[PDB]
Amino acid sequence: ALSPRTLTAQHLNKLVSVEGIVTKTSLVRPKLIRSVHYAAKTGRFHYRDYTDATTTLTTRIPTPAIYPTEDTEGNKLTTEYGYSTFIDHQRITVQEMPEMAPAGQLPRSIDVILDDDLVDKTKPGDRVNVVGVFKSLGAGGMNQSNSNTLIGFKTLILGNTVYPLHARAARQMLTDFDIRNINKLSKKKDIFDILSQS
Amino acid sequence: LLKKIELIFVNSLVVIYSELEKITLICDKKKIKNFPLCRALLRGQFPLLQKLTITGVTFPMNNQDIMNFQWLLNFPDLKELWIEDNDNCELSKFLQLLKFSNVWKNLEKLTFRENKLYPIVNLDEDQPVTNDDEVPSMLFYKENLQNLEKLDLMGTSISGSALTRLCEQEYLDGRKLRSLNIGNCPNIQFPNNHAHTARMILDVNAVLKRLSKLEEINLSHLSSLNDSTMKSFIINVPFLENLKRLDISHNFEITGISIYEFLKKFQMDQPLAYLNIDGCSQVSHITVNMIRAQNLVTQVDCVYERDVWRKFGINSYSYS
């Protein structure tokens, strides 16, 4: 159980929970995960799976997001949307709570990836707890086109659940005991004075 | 005096033959747009012809006698038939021939491979009666296929139930069958799959009970063989004790999990002799290195970069 400050390189590839405030939510985009193609002469439906470092918890070989256009025999393919499969994808920045940041330091932040039904579960300014796998991705400048010796690797949380918060939950649950107490108090003749004095 | 003739018609430009023993006709399907020996094969007889191998030709549309394999009745004693990428042929018409004549006293091996996906063929077990006062037509599937050692149906759109019916009817003999190739057949689904039409199901338990002594299985390009479906093979390990050579290559689904637990339960039988998983993008390199290291297979091939399977001469006589 961490925050965007105390989340540390020792935590990479572990399952972590981070508390913070959401900022800079990306647009929602469909991410291609499988495409299906009718080979016009052959009659078979070919298909192709896709992978990147966000779609999987393990570093499977990447797939270049290219659509097929020809069969092995050279027969022209046609892409079949509606049988092809896309997940919704969203990237959000969770910022450290300013109340927690130590003396004279500004809040740290980290980027979370959310997929399918987790998308749009938060808007900016939401205080949140995110659970997910903290990961690294990309080449980190090890690819020799990058001369810079010092830059680090990009890192993310691949999200598994998102809880909104106002603990000191954003929407409080009410027991029937709460319902009955709330109604009981409402019948006290001077309840407006009681609540406003409270 | 010619006993064995081969023709490899690389390009195009514009009666009794007792001597012959083997005819191999191979064509560039792109350049050749007809069927060279069509008149000769339908008109003549080649009564001592042991092996016939026709690939890449294009059957004429104007001749249902060709398309129904009516000529193919001409050749008794035909120890082996190989027929591959014959673009306008169909396994349906072939099985209709096999229904209605005892065409061959003996086939040791059959190999049929149509290229394009024709509609679903189910085993046509309908035995009609002209009248119930008259005989039902004797169906010659048994005595035609009773002899087979090698059955190969790669790419042929045979439905899974058709193959189970071939085994339940005991048309395929089992006691003599040794090598089965059903790769690239999109109409095969295994029992654990929830998504199907029931007559595409293969009942591997029934099949492997029937034909238990077989050596060599080929399921390459059988995308339907996901990891869940491999569980059916795991529990049916006791019925395939003769199996030495297993090709499941170019399966883009099969994770190393199924591979490993299959070889581990097989080890409860002594390694499997040989296994092919070339092009299988999902088998983890460390798993296959474990397979080598713990010696669960005497040889295993993992050329991930090998794009294609049709080694000419060895696996296929389709030209180039």
Curated annotation (Swiss-Prot), chain A:
Keywords: ATP-binding, DNA replication, DNA-binding, Helicase, Hydrolase, Nucleotide-binding, Nucleus, Phosphoprotein. It is found in: Nucleus. Its main location: nucleus. GO terms for molecular function: ATP binding; ATP hydrolysis activity; chromatin binding; DNA replication origin binding; helicase activity; MCM complex binding; single-stranded DNA binding. GO terms for biological process: DNA replication initiation; DNA strand elongation involved in DNA replication; double-strand break repair via break-induced replication; mitotic DNA replication initiation; pre-replicative complex assembly involved in nuclear cell cycle DNA replication; premeiotic DNA replication; silent mating-type cassette heterochromatin formation; subtelomeric heterochromatin formation. One of its GO terms (cellular component) is nuclear pre-replicative complex. Acts as a component of the MCM2-7 complex (MCM complex) which is the putative replicative helicase essential for 'once per cell cycle' DNA replication initiation and elongation in eukaryotic cells. The active ATPase sites in the MCM2-7 ring are formed through the interaction surfaces of two neighboring subunits such that a critical structure of a conserved arginine finger motif is provided in trans relative to the ATP-binding site of the Walker A box of the adjacent subunit. The six ATPase active sites, however, are likely to contribute differentially to the complex helicase activity. Component of the MCM2-7 complex. The complex forms a toroidal hexameric ring with the proposed subunit order MCM2-MCM6-MCM4-MCM7-MCM3-MCM5; loaded onto DNA, forms a head-head double hexamer. Interacts with CSM1. Belongs to the MCM family. Present with 35100 molecules/cell in log phase SD medium. Early fractionation of eukaryotic MCM proteins yielded a variety of dimeric, trimeric and tetrameric complexes with unclear biological significance. The MCM2-7 hexamer is the proposed physiological active complex. This is DNA replication licensing factor MCM3. It comes from Saccharomyces cerevisiae (strain ATCC 204508 / S288c) (Baker's yeast). The chain holds residues 165 to 366 of 971 of the full protein.
From Swiss-Prot, chain B:
LRR repeats lie at residues 20-44, 75-100, 104-127, 145-169, 174-197, 211-232, 240-264. It is found in: Nucleus. F-box protein component of a SCF (SKP1-CUL1-F-box protein) E3 ubiquitin-protein ligase complex which mediates the ubiquitination and subsequent proteasomal degradation of target proteins. Probably recognizes and binds to phosphorylated target proteins. The SCF(DIA2) complex is specifically involved in the pheromone induced degradation of phosphorylated TEC1. The SCF(DIA2) complex binds to DNA replication origins. Component of the SCF(DIA2) complex containing CDC53, SKP1, RBX1 and DIA2. Interacts with SKP1. Belongs to the DIA2 family. This is Protein DIA2. It comes from Saccharomyces cerevisiae (strain ATCC 204508 / S288c) (Baker's yeast). The lineage of its organism: Eukaryota, Fungi, Dikarya, Ascomycota, Saccharomycotina. The chain holds residues 366 to 732 of 732 of the full protein.
